[PDB]
Amino acid sequence: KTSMLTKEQANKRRQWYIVDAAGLVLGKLAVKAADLIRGKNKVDFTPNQDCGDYLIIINSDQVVLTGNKKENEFWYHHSQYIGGIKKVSGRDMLKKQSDKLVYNAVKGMLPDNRLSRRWITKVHVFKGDKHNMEAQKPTTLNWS
Amino acid sequence: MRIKGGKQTRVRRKKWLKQASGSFGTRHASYKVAKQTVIQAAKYAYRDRRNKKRDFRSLWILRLNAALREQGMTYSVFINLLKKHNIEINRKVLSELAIKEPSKFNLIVQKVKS
Amino acid sequence: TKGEVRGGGKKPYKQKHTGKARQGSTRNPHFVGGGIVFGPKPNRNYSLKLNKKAHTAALHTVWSEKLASDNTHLVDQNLFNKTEGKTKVMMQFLKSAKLLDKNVLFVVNTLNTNLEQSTSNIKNVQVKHLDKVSVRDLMLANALLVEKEVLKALEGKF
Amino acid sequence: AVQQRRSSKHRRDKRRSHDALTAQALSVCQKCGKKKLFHRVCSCGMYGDLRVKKAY
Amino acid sequence: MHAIVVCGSKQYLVHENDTFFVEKLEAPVGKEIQLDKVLMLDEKIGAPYLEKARVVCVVEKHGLQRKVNVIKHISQKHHLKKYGHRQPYTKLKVVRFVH
Amino acid sequence: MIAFAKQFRVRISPQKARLVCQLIVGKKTADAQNILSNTPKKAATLIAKLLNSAIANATNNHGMNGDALYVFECVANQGPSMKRTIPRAKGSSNMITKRSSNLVVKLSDNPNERQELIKQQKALVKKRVEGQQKAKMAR
RNA sequence: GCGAAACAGUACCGUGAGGGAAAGGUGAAAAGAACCCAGAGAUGGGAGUGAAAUAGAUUCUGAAACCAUAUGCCUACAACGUGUCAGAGCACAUUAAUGUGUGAUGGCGUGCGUUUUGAAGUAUGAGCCGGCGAGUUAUGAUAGCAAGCGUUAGUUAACCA
RNA sequence: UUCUCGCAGUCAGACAGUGGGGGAUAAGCUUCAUUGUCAAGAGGGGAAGAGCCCAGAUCAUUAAAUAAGGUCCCCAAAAUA
RNA sequence: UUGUGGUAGACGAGCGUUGUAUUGGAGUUGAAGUCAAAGCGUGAGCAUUGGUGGAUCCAAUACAAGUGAGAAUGCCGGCA
C-alpha cells in the first residue's frame, strides 16, 4: 500500500546568511527571501515543522524601484478609527523608513498561517550600513 | 401485542455516540448533535481520501524540484529526460526518498545524459 | 379509540396568541390520555377458509406419510380393556414399548371408556375420536397408535 | 433583551473563573488559645494587654 | 542492499530485513514467492524493466486494515445511504533478492 | 483510610458551599478549622461541624494518628431539589426551584492514596484483561 | 390498563353546569439498627442482626441531559460550524490488533430537518435528555403470484354437531 | 423510443448560448421556440457562484497519462526566441 | 462484456422487538437490563469479557403485529 513517507522529527537546523541588496528590485528580492525563509530549495521541506533558515539584509536604503512606480503607487495603512488612512508614497518611505517596505513585502510573501508569525522573526533588515548581528558568523551571497 | 421497544433506541444512540469521541463541547454527549457531527466528519473523510492523494503528490513534486534546482536544471526537463529519452517509469516517491539515501539519486540524475 | 374515552370537548387553550402548541384537547393520541389512533378491535375474524377438497387431501397425505413408518403400531380392544382405571399400568406399558418421551395420541373409533379414564394426567397422551383429530395434531404425535377399525373408515373417507 | 444562543458550561466557567474567596489574615492572641483575626478581638475579650469584652 | 519492487500498481523501496505492506496477492502463507516486475536495482538499470531479475520474499501474514465506514448524505434531500469497507492486505518481508 | 462523614439535604446552594470547598482543600487539620470558622458565609459553618464530626470519627474508630491528616476532597452535590410556585404580575406564575446540597468531606493520613485509587483501577482493568485471556485458552 | 393498582371523581380549578391530577416494589423473616464517638438535634461514622446494610427506611433493577473531584496530555499571537487527512513530542499497554489517550504543527473545511426556481441563512422547526407519539381494521372490487379441484367443472352461506 | 397491462409522481421553473414577442433590443423582467446545466449532480477551473467552461463520483491505494485552465511567490507546474 | 450519481417514485432482496406453536439449550457455578472495554458484517446490527443483579432467558423454523423516532411553536417527567 504505502511506504510510510518520512517526515522530520523536529530536527530543524538553521543557518545564517547576509544578502547585501545593491541594485536589486523589490519583487525579485522578496521572492528569494521567501524562498530562503520556507526552505523551498532545501531537500528536507515539510510544512508541518517550519524547515527554514535565517536571513539578514543590509543597506535597505539602496533598493530601487523601476519605471514610474516611485510617484504613482501608494502604500496604505489603516487605523481602526474613522478616516485613519495613513497614505504614503514610495519616495517617502525610501527616505524616512525603508525597512518597513521590505518587511511588509516579505510578510506579503508568506501564507497567512500560524507559522508566518514565526516565519517573519527570521528576517532582519537594517536601514544603515552596520548591524549588531555579528555573532552568528553568517555567509555572504548575492541575488538571493 | 403492545410493543415497548427500548433496546433498539439505546443501542443505536450508544453506537452513534461512541463514533464521535474526543469532541469539543457537548458534541460527544448529545446523540442528536453527535450524529450530525459524525455525518460531517465522514463527509470530510470522504473528500480528504482524495485531497490527501492529491496533496501528497503536490509535496512529491515540490520536494523533487527542491533537489533538482540545485543541479542547475529544471524539473520539467528531468521528467522530459525520463520520458522521451532513456525511457524511465521510475516512481516519484522512490526518487524522492532516494534523497534520504545520499547521492544514490545522483546516479539517476547522471544517467539521463546518454 | 380517540372518541370513546371520557375527557374534555373544550380546548384547554385558545387557538392563537398562546406560547404553546396549536392543539387543544385533553385525550389526543399525543397526550398521556390513551386514545390510540389504530389498534386491535374486538371484531377480528382471525380465520381463513380452505376448500374442503384441499383439506381432505391434506388429511389423506398426512395419513399416508405417517402410516409408512415403523414408529406407529396397531392397537386393539385388548390392552384397552386389560388395564383398569389405574394409569400406572399404561405407564408400565409405555416403558415396555419405550414411548415415554413421545407425544403419542390415541385415535379410536369405538370411544372406549376404559382407555379414556386413564391418560388424563399426562402431558404426552390424550384420547380422541377419528372425526375429532385434525391434520395438525395427527402429525404432532411423533408416534401413532391406531385402532384396527379405523382403517376401513379412513379408506372410505379417503 | 435576552440571550440568543445558549451559554454552555464553558461560558459560565470562564465567567466564574474569577470569583473565588481569598483567605482572611489570622493572628494568635497572647493569652487566648485561639486563631483569631488580624486587628480584631476574638470571643475571649482581649486585643492583647487591654481587656474589653466579656468572657463569653 | 537497497532494492525496488512494485506490487499491483504501487511501488516500494525495500531494505533487507525490512517489512512492507501490499494488497492481497492471492498467494499461500509461509512460502517464498519470487516477484518478476522489478525496476531499477542497485547500479543496474533496465529502462523498461530489469532484465532476468527477480525479487524473492516470504509473505508474513494476511490482515484487515482499520474499518472505514463511508456514509453518503445529500444535504436536506432525504438521503442517508451508508456503506462499510475494509482492506484485505498482505504483510511481507524480503530475504534473498537476486540480481 | 477515608474516614468520611456524610450529610444529606442541607439548606444551602451548591456553588456557595463549593466555594468554601476550594477554600478548605489543600490544608491539614490544624490549619482547616481556624480558616473555616472565620469565613462570613453560612455554607462554611455547617462544613465546620461536619469536619469536626469527621475528625472525631477518624480519631475514634479507624484509629490513625489524628494529627497528620488533611482534607482530601470536597463536593457540592445537588441533592433532591424542591419546587414551589410564586405569584407574579397579571397571573403569570413561575416555579421557584429550592436547591438542595449533599455535602460530604474526606480525610487522608498520607501524602499518598491519591494514586492508590488509580492502582485499584489498574488492578480492576488487569482482572478484566485476565478474564478475557481465560476465554482465549478455551479453544 | 377504565380518568381511579395507593382511603379518585378524592387533591385542586372554579359561586355553579362542569373541568378534572400525580405517585405501587427494603429485606426470606424488622431480624427497622442495643450500645459508643462527634454534634443541640436531625444525622453520620462505627459496633450488632442479616448471605448481602452499595437492601437502612430517600427503602427492586439505577443508565441521560446535569454538576462536582481525580490520573495523563494540551492551551494564554488566537480569526475557530471547531471536524477531517498527514504530523513531532508526551504518558501508558490492548477484545495483539500495521495498538491506545492526548494533538504542538500543515492542507482542506459556511450544521441537521421542512418548504422551495432555489439553502449556512438576514425565512423557517427543535434548549438538552428519557418514554409515548401515524398506514391498520371490517365489508366488497380490481390485478399479479401461489395453492387445491377440472370436462357438466368448482363452490358453500346462514344454521345444526 | 411500438403494442396489452400493474402502479405512481409531476400541472409555480430558473439559468447560458442563440431565433423572436411585450418593454425604450432595461433588468437576476415577462412571455415562446431550440440546444445543454440545475431541479435530482458531487469534482476541477472561473478567487468567492445551480446554471458559465471541462465530465459523469462503487470503494480502497502516500500509483501513471490527459480535458478546461495555468507555470514568480501566495498555490503544484517553463523555458527558449 | 456492459454498467453501478440520484431525490419525487416503482420494484426486489433482508435485519430487529413482543407474543404463540412446537423441536434443543442455558440459568444461585449467577439471566435480563445497564455501566465501560483497543471486537465481527455491505446495512438495520450481531459477539466476547469484568463490575453492578438476584430471577428468567437463548438458539433454528413459522405465524400475528398497539412494532423500529430528529424535528410536529409538541405532551408528560427531570435537568442546564
Provide a descriptive summary of the structure in words.
This is part of a larger assembly, with chains A (144 residues), B (114 residues), C (158 residues), D (56 residues), E (99 residues) and F (139 residues). Chain A has 144 residues and is an alpha/beta fold. Helix content of chain A is 25%, strand content 16%. Chain A has one domain. Chain A is built from 5 helices and 6 strands. In chain A, helix 1 (26-38) links the parallel strand 1 and strand 2. The longest helix of chain A has 13 residues, at 26-38. Chain A is globular. Chain C is built from 6 helices and 4 strands, in the order αβααβαβαβα. In chain C, strands 1-4-2-3 form a 4-stranded parallel beta sheet. In chain D, the strands form 2 sheets. A two-stranded antiparallel sheet of chain D has the order 1-2. In chain D, strands 3-4 form a two-stranded antiparallel ribbon. In chain D, a hairpin with a 6-residue loop joins strand 1 (26-28) and strand 2 (35-37). Chains in contact: A-B, A-E, B-E, D-F. Chain B binds 3 RNA strands through helix 1, helix 2 and helix 3. Chain F: Belongs to the universal ribosomal protein uL22 family. Chain F: One of its GO terms (molecular function) is rRNA binding.
Give the helix level of chain E as a range of percent. under 10%
**What is the count of DSSP helices of chain D, taking H or I runs of 4+ residues?**
1
Beta fraction of chain E: 35-45%
Biggest sheet strand line-up of chain D? 1-2
Individual helix count of chain E:
0
List the helices and strands of chain E in order.
Answer: EEEEEEEE
Q: Alpha-carbon distance between the termini of chain E?
A: 11 Å
H/E element order of chain D: HEEEE
- Helix amount of chain D: 10-25%
Strand order of the largest sheet of chain E: 3-8-5-4
Shape category of chain D: rod-shaped
Number of strands of chain E: 8
How many structural domains in the coordinates of chain E? 1
What is the number of beta strands of chain D? 4
N-C termini distance of chain D: 53 Å
Number of structural units classed as domains of chain D: 1
Function (chain E): This protein binds to 23S rRNA in the presence of protein L20.
Subunit structure (chain E): Part of the 50S ribosomal subunit. Contacts protein L20.
Keywords (chain E): Ribonucleoprotein, Ribosomal protein, RNA-binding, rRNA-binding
Family (chain E): Belongs to the bacterial ribosomal protein bL21 family.
